[PDB]
Design a binder for this molecule. Structure first.
Ligand code: HEM
Ligand SMILES: OC[C@@H]1O[C@@H](O[C@H]2[C@@H](O)[C@H](O)[C@H](OCCCCCC3CCCCC3)O[C@@H]2CO)[C@H](O)[C@@H](O)[C@@H]1O
Ligand SMILES: OC[C@@H]1O[C@@H](O[C@H]2[C@@H](O)[C@H](O)[C@H](OCCCCCC3CCCCC3)O[C@@H]2CO)[C@H](O)[C@@H](O)[C@@H]1O
Length: 463
């Protein structure tokens, strides 16, 4: 090869002068145009292989799934995670934590009720809360952050919080503030030059402080769990982990220690809230812009579910139009546009190039989600992208918003359940309106995560 082709770097500065000022995603897409679907870019000293297009991403993450199963650091959060917890671990630590997390989230949670039942109940609480606004203008950001946070709380703490609980809201505010800071231009600069910038004030110090405050709270919950534990009846993720810590106490090689507990719980909040919340927020923005689509979803809800019974996950298979709409919301939403960093786990043979062991790799998910091979109108909201000639749901190789391979989103099922039940339970009970006429609504957004514009909305009780 030897490494994939790319711009010639400077020492220290890497490919700074070949980057685009609009950000990392724009820098990558521009470089793609010159160098092709697989290229090397130096971010500071670090060479990083970038994978664009559906093929290159699948050839890596699926065809060499084990080789591309490594996880890269994110400079602004590494001082917190330090390669612990389920997202940022590698090797055996990652395998053990992922195996445990998959199994546990599937089986243990608030009131012994299933994840689906907990989401249905959160949706019922949400409908009750929206009813109280009586059609007032609101910004739905807070409530969407609240319901997605409450699902993770149900899983990990075995409880949910009232929407107006002030301590819940103080910690929610400072937690979600972190995402904006992580996806900012300043944090992208920090990705490049952290080795220098860590010695100076900046967003990285605010991100650190916010997440440490959350870690303190998680620590306090772990102590409270331990003090109230019934080993015959584990409540939630924390109880199950404590029991595993007990089961492995005599094994100093075990990953099931305190640091992995705190940071795995943090990881579930970090990965499980913002993306799901912003998807819902983006979805409702689209539903304001395209009332004919929203009307059709409501028609389908009426036909399949009706106007009394709450939506259930079983309904989704009978609702291909609504399902296609959710797919298209995720696709156009493109909330994690250049993926979460991977690494190769060994020197890796890829398209004639050799990628040394531990080289970082970015799967540019955006480039699959906008691939014109797979989506006739990639920049236009089109639920027909996911519907066949008989009006049935159709699957698409370009559709990869949860990534692919061994690192695929651990919470894809939960996220899928949340989108379906929240969208349908809301629309079953409320129509929507806003001060801005549909044609005037602007969908224009961004870093590791995408962020749509702020907007007002009215939830109008139907009946
Ligand atoms: C619409 C919502 C969501 C989207 C689009 C999304 C997408 C993603 C993506 C792109 C990744 C990176 C995979 C990779 O490394 O290539 C990821 C990882 C992850 N996600 Fe999600 N996610 C969502 C919601 C959730 C939820 C609700 C949970 C938990 C219940 C969750 C848990 C995780 C975890 C733990 C990882 C790290 C996986 C690993 O490193 O093994 N996600 N997700
Ligand atoms: O050689 C110095 C100058 O080069 C040209 O500008 C270049 C670059 O030198 C110029 O710096 C600019 O790049 C923008 C800086 C990139 C930093 C932004 C990064 C911050 C971190 C994450 C996102 C990327 O874009 C142009 C790309 O062609 C200009 O045409 C001339 O002013 C001059 O020749
Ligand atoms: O006297 C203080 C206690 O009040 C009650 O509630 C506690 C705690 O038990 C309870 O867990 C609560 O937590 C509120 C904060 C929840 C934050 C969770 C966030 C994590 C990150 C994403 C957003 C959600 O804090 C309350 C105030 O201290 C508890 O019922 C009792 O333990 C005790 O009476």
């Amino acid at each position: 090869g030897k490494l994939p082709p790319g711009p010639s770097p400077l020492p220290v500065l890497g490919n700074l002068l070949q980057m685009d000022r609009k950000g990392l995603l724009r820098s990558f897409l521009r470089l793609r145009e010159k160098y092709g679907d697989v290229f090397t870019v130096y971010l500071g000293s670090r060479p990083v292989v970038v994978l664009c297009g559906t093929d290159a991403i699948r050839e890596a993450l699926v065809d060499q799934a084990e080789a591309f199963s490594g996880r890269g650091k994110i400079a602004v959060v590494d001082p917190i995670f330090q390669g612990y917890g389920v997202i940022f671990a590698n090797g055996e630590r990652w395998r053990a934590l992922r195996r445990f997390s998959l199994a546990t989230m599937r089986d243990f949670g608030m009131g012994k009720r299933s994840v689906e039942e907990r989401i249905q109940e959160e949706a019922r609480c949400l409908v009750e809360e929206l009813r109280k606004s009586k059609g007032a203008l609101l910004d739905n950001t807070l409530l969407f952050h609240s319901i997605t946070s409450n699902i993770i709380c149900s899983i990990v703490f075995g409880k949910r919080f009232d929407y107006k609980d002030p301590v819940f809201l103080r910690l929610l505010d400072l937690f979600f503030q972190s995402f904006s800071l992580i996806s900012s231009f300043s944090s992208q600069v920090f990705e490049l030059f952290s080795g220098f910038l860590k010695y100076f004030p900046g967003t990285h110090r605010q991100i650190y402080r916010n997440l440490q405050e959350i870690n303190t709270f998680i620590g306090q919950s772990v102590e409270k769990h331990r003090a109230t534990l019934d080993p015959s009846n584990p409540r939630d993720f924390i109880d199950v982990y404590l029991l595993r810590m007990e089961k492995d106490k005599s094994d100093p090689s075990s990953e099931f220690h305190h640091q992995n507990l705190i940071l795995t719980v943090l990881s579930l909040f970090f990965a499980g809230t913002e993306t799901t919340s912003t998807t819902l927020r983006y979805g409702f923005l689209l539903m304001l812009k395209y009332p004919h689509v929203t009307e059709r979803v409501q028609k389908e809800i009426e036909q399949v579910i009706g106007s009394h019974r709450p939506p259930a996950l079983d309904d989704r298979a009978k609702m291909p139009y609504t399902d296609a709409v959710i797919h298209e919301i995720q696709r156009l939403g493109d909330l994690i546009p250049f993926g979460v960093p991977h690494t190769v786990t060994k020197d890796t043979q890829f398209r004639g190039y050799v990628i040394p062991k531990n080289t970082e790799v970015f799967p540019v998910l955006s480039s699959a989600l906008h691939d014109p091979r797979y989506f006739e109108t990639p920049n236009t909201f089109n639920p027909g992208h996911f519907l066949d000639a008989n009006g049935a749901l159709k699957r698409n190789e370009g559709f990869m918003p949860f990534s692919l391979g061994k690192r695929i989103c651990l919470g894809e099922g939960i996220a899928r359940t949340e989108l379906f039940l929240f969208f349908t339970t809301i629309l079953q009970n409320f129509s929507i309106a806003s001060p801005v006429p549909p044609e005037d609504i602007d969908l224009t957004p961004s870093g590791v995560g995408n962020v749509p514009p702020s907007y007002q909305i009215r939830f109008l009780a139907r009946h």
